[PDB]
Write a structure and sequence with these properties.
Chain D: Its main location: cytoplasm. This is part of a larger assembly, with chains A, B, C and D. Chain A has one domain. Chain A is about 20% helix and about 0% strand. Chain A has 2 helices and no strands. The longest helix of chain D is centred in the N-terminal third of the chain and has 15 residues. By secondary structure, chain D is of the alpha+beta class. In chain D, about 35% of the residues lie in helices and about 25% in strands. In chain D, a hairpin with a 3-residue loop joins β3 and β4. The relative contact order of chain D is 0.17. Chain D has a 4-stranded antiparallel β-sheet, with helices on both faces. Chain D is built from 5 helices and 4 strands; from the N terminus they run ααβαβαββα. The chains are: A mainly alpha, B alpha+beta, C mainly alpha, D alpha+beta. Chain C binds 2 RNA strands through α1, α2, α3, α4 and α5.
RNA sequence: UGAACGCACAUUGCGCCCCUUGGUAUUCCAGGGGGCAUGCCUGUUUGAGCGUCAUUU
RNA sequence: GUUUGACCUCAAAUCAGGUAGGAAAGCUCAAAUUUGAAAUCUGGUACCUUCGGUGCCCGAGUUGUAAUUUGGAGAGGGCAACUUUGGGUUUGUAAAGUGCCUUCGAAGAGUCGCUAAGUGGGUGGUCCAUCUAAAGCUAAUAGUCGAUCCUAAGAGAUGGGGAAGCUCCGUUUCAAAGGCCUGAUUUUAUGCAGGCCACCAUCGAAAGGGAAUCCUUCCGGAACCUGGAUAUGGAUUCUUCACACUGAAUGUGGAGAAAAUCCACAGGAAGGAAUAGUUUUCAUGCCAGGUCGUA
């Protein structure tokens, strides 16, 4: 019977405290991340080297867009574990600040 | 300055006793306990003695409850185990029942076991001084055990016990029986041997 | 009042640092991090960082002292202490050469449960549906992962079972709204109880595990997320009249082993 | 039994074994406090003769007292009284002699805890629980 | 208050820990409740010591 | 195996539960193996018929806890067609008793008298008589004035030591005498690793040091001190600490003047930018100030 009952039930309780700061989700993926993006999104070799030489925390984008003519041609993503590890590290090591943008 | 504060008093006394152990000229009866079994003989002795380890409380309780549950619904051979306890083993030795007696070398009131090698030799019982009283308790299910003994052995291991007794007789008894009765502990330090032995 | 002292009250009493919190809890740093992960505790940023730290500009991490005061009373810390005692006693049992008592000790042990922590983190089901996004992300990452020395086969099997159950429910209820195939994986966005839930599923290809990453943290995150999904999946299945946990068809599992 | 050998051995206090052991032990004793607790009896046979049982609620204290009748009364009585004052929740059962110097005599005092259930629930020893 | 027990006391002075409540209140202030002496015993948990050991299938 | 782990000794916790302060009758241990089975016991926990009982669990204990034995002996066996039975319902080939036969058969050391003995030893009697020590039980009107804070000569806890004791000595002494910082969470898989610093509580001043109120507490007007959270303007000048103006560990100086207290200087750790970058010893803005004495 481990975890075999109703936890929340019918309750509608809220956790709206002054110092309850919720992580603001994660931005949705954009066009350039697609497996078959429009041709204009691909980086030039100069831009590719500029991205390659930038520090991992200074890169505006954590990947190089690629275009594939078929679904079977797509390769398994390489930095898949590292992204989850970085997200989980931010979830409890990154200070959270209220701000009025 | 005063650097002694890097050792607490108990550590300092604990090491001073260690120094006094090797500097003092100890009598032969207390000196004999520094001659123990070597690596191979001690490793082979604990392979036989670990096959006759007594049942723990939980195992004995489980075995008795199985019999009780069988009876509650609707001819065994004598057990075999290592004998321990100082009085029990001493009584066994003077009745000539123990086949092999292991004596720990680090009994804190050393006078509890000083008579044991002499009693074992006088009564014609094979004995061996084994390094570690906490190791004799592992095969006894106690934290420490001053002594251990083997009175009866399963017929499969009768040859092994005889061979072990012969090995201990050749390696321990016949090897140390002349130096066992000599005063020990006359080890000289470097700052003292340099000025006495050389001069 | 006499004169009062400086740097003792105000912006300095409600912000305590990592070392102070760890020594106040009388617990190791690893267990402090585990408790913060489970309870959802995060560092802060006071408006006067030169006052929260007592007049010092040295860098440090602040933690909202009342959060640590609440963490003082958590029943999981006592379970951590009990596990430490159990490990010491089991080590003693094996070190003495007595294996039956070691087996007996491992039979008589109980681990902690994260039920109350999940209840207080999410007082209502919608909050669980809000965090289910990243919960599903982590679980779907662990589902497509080879077993190694640190992460075991059973952990990955449990994660895969949870992922398959979630996919089966979403397919049965026909809740998929958006899909996006990217170079990283596939993003699915579904409509769970009036909330938009978007999760990433990697491609089923062999993974290259980097020695850089610390799976010691990802395992705790997965341990929390697995229980969160267990409760959320039970609630979702029982609200729709389905039977939970779903019966596994062993004949159809041997061919494809998916949601079907 | 092994206690007969210990009793016969302790009757020869100037033999090599006992003289060596006492020489080491008196120096070791002089480094500890005047009244300290022994982990276990130094002479278990004498403790058994005097009524000591290896069970919970039995305590041993080692105490040293200065010798001589000058000051610039029994020594055992003073030792037992100081030990009893140190442990006021126990009753002084007995005491025996362990060592001596030209300056101090050393005694080990056997005490019993009346409030322990192992002493309260056995008829052979709950006489000392009476006030 | 007194053997008199958070620390002092020729002052009716000075602190620390936990829970809870009220005022603009995550920070400030106040109120309420409960605790913090020494020697010793049994047990629990956490330790120190190149003190004694074992440590190749 | 430069690893890992068993013990031993010594510690700590506002750890769990306790304890101390003051005012007419005979018997029980130790000493000889339960060894075909530590058979014994405290505590935690759950129930019950609760001065306790049962189940489960962590421990104590073989350097010895139970049963049996105490010269009056006693023990292990055998034979009577021997005799007897507990607890608020009994029962187990369980616990005892009497007679006879047979095999065995321990005995308290710095103690008796510098320091012993086992047909031993103690005490008496003019060789004999009588007991069995060195173990035990047993009925018949104040935020602003002072105290409060600080230390001065000195007194005096803790650690330790002496004394039969009421108590005395000694004040940092062969005391484990406590605070702080760093880190992706700590490499056979989530049981803390590394580093820094030295030295002692407390009491002792209403004339010493000390934040602040006047025309000293109430009233009216006017003003300061300390502590805290914060907002605005300006500065930090092309985008990153000026010609207000960041500054860690660490080491010094001034005021006080023995200490409390305030300030500053060397030092270079760390931090700072594109829909509000970092600092706020610059200015303005908000709140509060308890107890005791006061004729």
């Amino acid at each position: 019977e481990n975890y075999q009952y109703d936890l929340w039930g019918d309750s509608t309780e809220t956790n709206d405290h002054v110092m309850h700061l919720r992580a603001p989700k994660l931005p949705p993926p954009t066009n350039e991340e697609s497996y078959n993006p429009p041709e204009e999104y691909l980086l030039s070799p100069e831009e590719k080297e500029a991205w390659e030489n930038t520090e991992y925390s200074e890169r505006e984008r954590n990947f190089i867009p690629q275009k594939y003519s078929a679904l079977r041609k797509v390769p398994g993503y390489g930095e898949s574990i590292r992204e989850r590890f970085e997200r989980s590290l931010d979830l409890y090591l990154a200070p959270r600040v209220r701000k009025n943008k | 300055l005063s650097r002694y504060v890097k050792w607490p008093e108990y550590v300092r006394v604990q090491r001073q006793k260690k120094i006094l152990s090797i500097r003092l000229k100890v009598p032969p009866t207390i000196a004999q306990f520094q001659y123990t079994l070597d690596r191979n003989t001690a490793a082979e002795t604990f392979k036989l003695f670990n096959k006759y380890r007594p049942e723990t409380a939980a195992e004995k309780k489980e075995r008795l409850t199985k019999e009780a549950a069988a009876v509650a619904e609707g001819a065994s051979p004598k057990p075999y185990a290592v004998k321990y306890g100082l009085n029990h083993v001493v009584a066994l030795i003077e009745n000539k029942k123990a086949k092999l007696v292991l004596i720990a070398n680090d009994v804190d009131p050393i006078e509890l076991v000083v008579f044991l090698p002499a009693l074992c030799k006088k009564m014609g019982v094979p004995y061996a001084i084994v390094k570690g009283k906490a190791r004799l308790g592992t095969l006894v299910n106690q934290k420490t055990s001053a002594v251990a003994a083997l009175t009866e052995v399963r017929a499969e291991d009768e040859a092994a016990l005889a061979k072990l007794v012969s090995t201990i007789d050749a390696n321990f008894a016949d090897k140390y029986d002349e130096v066992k009765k000599h005063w020990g502990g006359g080890i000289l330090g470097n700052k003292a041997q340099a000025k006495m032995d050389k001069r | 009042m006499r004169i009062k002292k400086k740097n003792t009250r105000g912006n300095a009493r409600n912000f305590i640092t990592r070392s102070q919190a760890v020594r106040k809890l009388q617990v190791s740093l690893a267990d402090f991090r585990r408790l913060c992960i489970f309870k959802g505790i995060y560092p802060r940023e006071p408006r006067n960082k030169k006052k929260a730290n007592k007049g010092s500009t040295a860098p440090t991490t602040f933690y909202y002292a009342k959060d640590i005061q609440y963490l003082m009373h958590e029943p999981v810390l006592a379970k951590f202490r009990e596990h430490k005692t159990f490990a010491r006693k089991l080590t003693r049992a094996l070190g003495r050469g007595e294996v039956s008592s070691a087996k007996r000790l491992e039979e008589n042990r109980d681990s902690y449960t994260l039920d109350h922590i999940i209840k207080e983190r999410y007082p209502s089901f919608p909050d669980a549906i809000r965090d289910i996004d990243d919960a599903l992300n982590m679980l779907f990452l662990f589902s497509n992962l080879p077993s190694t020395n640190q992460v075991s086969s059973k952990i990955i099997n449990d994660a895969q079972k949870i992922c398959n159950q979630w996919l089966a429910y979403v397919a049965k209820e026909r809740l998929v709204r958006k899909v996006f195939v990217s170079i990283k994986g596939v993003y699915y966005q579904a409509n769970i109880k009036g909330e938009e839930v978007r999760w990433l599923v990697p491609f089923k290809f062999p993974e290259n595990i980097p020695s850089d990453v610390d799976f010691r943290i990802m395992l705790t995150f997965l341990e929390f997320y697995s229980t969160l999904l267990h409760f959320v999946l039970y609630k979702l299945y029982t609200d729709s009249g389905l039977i939970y946990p779903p019966k596994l068809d062993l004949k159809k599992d041997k061919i494809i082993s998916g949601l079907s | 039994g092994a206690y007969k050998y210990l009793e016969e051995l302790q009757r020869k206090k100037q033999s090599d074994v006992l003289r060596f052991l006492q020489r080491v032990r008196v120096w070791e004793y002089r480094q500890k406090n005047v009244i300290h607790r022994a982990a276990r009896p130094t002479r278990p046979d004498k403790a058994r003769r005097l009524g000591y049982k290896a069970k919970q609620g039995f305590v041993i204290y080692r105490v040293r007292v200065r010798r001589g009748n000058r000051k610039r009364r029994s020594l055992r009585a003073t030792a037992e009284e100081r030990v009893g004052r140190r442990a006021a929740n126990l009753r002084v059962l007995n005491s025996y002699w362990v060592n001596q110097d030209s300056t101090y005599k050393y005694f080990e005092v056997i005490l019993v805890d009346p409030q322990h259930k192992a002493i309260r629930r056995d008829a052979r020893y709950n006489w000392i629980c009476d006030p």
